Design a protein around this ligand. Structure first.
Ligand SMILES: O=C(O)CNC(=O)C(=O)O
Ligand SMILES: [Mg+2]
Ligand code: NI
Ligand SMILES: [Zn+2]
Length: 331
């Protein structure tokens, strides 16, 4: 069995290996990459996503989200308070202001210590989930707006043609902006490219151990757990590495820098934070190996998780018994 300790693997494809996206994901899995739940891909030195980032300031962040925490430093939830629209140039100036900027620090480990000690006492503003792409249309390799769609994969594997579309999303971050513990919708893969700016630190639980994280989360968030049998789908709960280690939950950590891709694998729980002003692009995708995960994925039916148009067909075809209850949650 390849990668039996479920370590995060780092790949350095050549320009020739970077041509065929599906084939390289399958290669990474042949080496056991998926057992970690997360892998890093460093593009070949010849590759670029676009020529420059000098002309992005007029992108609009229509609904910036202020991430307000409740709880204790290692075990907290966050809610998202909607703020007035601002441009990327306005948001970058805000991120760099004395109120929001990254503090002085020694290295990534010192900054991680400061994040976990102090996150709850601040409310950073995240420009998340913005439909769009920063890949140049002429970038032919690993262009997140030109991937094979999940609807086409389902059709290729299972023969059923379905409605829906699959497009990327931009994330503009600042110091302490936070992504809560989650797997993807329908336990899909994700791919995330850090286009510019400061790093993003990730935490991940191997898919084979995801139920250990879920049982801890039910213990730590007991009211939320009574409210919903899949409340991590709400994407609001945070648990620190120290707390994970105290409770024996297997996990790994890695820091992504500008110019690097991360891939999350089906049912790989992940969480993390941004180091300072940055911009990432991410999209979900599927492979043949995903189908069995999609069929078994938990679902939120309490009404909180509210998701995209295209998840309807995935539930309807892969989980017909759950469809009626899930759809009631959506309506
Ligand atoms: O970058 C973020 O805030 C969150 N991204 C992801 O969870 C992902 O790419 O799957
Ligand atoms: Mg612009
Ligand atoms: Ni994710
Ligand atoms: Zn729910």
């Amino acid at each position: 069995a390849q990668n039996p300790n479920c370590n995060i693997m780092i790949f350095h494809p050549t320009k020739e290996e970077f041509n065929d996206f599906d084939k390289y994901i399958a290669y990474m899995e042949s080496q056991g990459a998926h057992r970690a739940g997360l892998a890093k891909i460093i593009p070949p030195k010849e590759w670029k996503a676009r020529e420059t980032y000098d002309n992005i300031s007029e992108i609009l962040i229509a609904t910036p989200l202020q991430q307000v925490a409740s709880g204790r430093a290692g075990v907290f939830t966050q809610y998202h308070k909607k703020k007035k629209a601002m441009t990327v140039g306005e948001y970058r100036h805000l991120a760099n202001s004395k109120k929001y900027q990254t503090p002085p620090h020694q290295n990534f480990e010192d900054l991680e210590r400061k994040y976990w000690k102090n996150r709850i006492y601040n409310s950073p503003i995240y420009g998340a989930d913005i439909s769009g792409s920063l890949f140049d249309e002429n970038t032919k390799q690993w262009n997140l707006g030109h991937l094979g769609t999940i609807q086409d994969l389902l059709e290729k594997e299972c023969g059923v043609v379905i409605e829906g579309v699959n497009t990327p999303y931009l994330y503009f971050g600042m110091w302490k902006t936070t992504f809560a513990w989650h797997t993807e919708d329908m336990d899909l893969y994700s791919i995330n490219y850090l286009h510019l700016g400061e790093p993003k630190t990730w935490y991940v639980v191997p898919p084979e151990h995801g139920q250990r994280l879920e049982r801890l989360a039910r213990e730590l968030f007991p009211g939320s757990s009574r409210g919903c049998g899949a409340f991590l789908r709400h994407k609001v709960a945070l648990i620190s590495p120290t707390v994970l280690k105290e409770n024996g939950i297997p996990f790994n950590r890695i820091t992504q820098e500008a110019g690097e891709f991360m891939v999350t694998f089906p049912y790989g729980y992940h969480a993390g934070f941004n180091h300072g002003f940055n911009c990432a692009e991410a999209i979900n995708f599927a492979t043949p190996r995903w189908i069995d995960y999609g069929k078994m994925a938990s679902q939120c039916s309490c009404g909180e998780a509210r998701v995209t148009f295209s998840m309807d067909a995935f539930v309807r075809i892969l989980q017909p018994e759950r469809y009626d209850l899930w759809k009631r949650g959506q309506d």
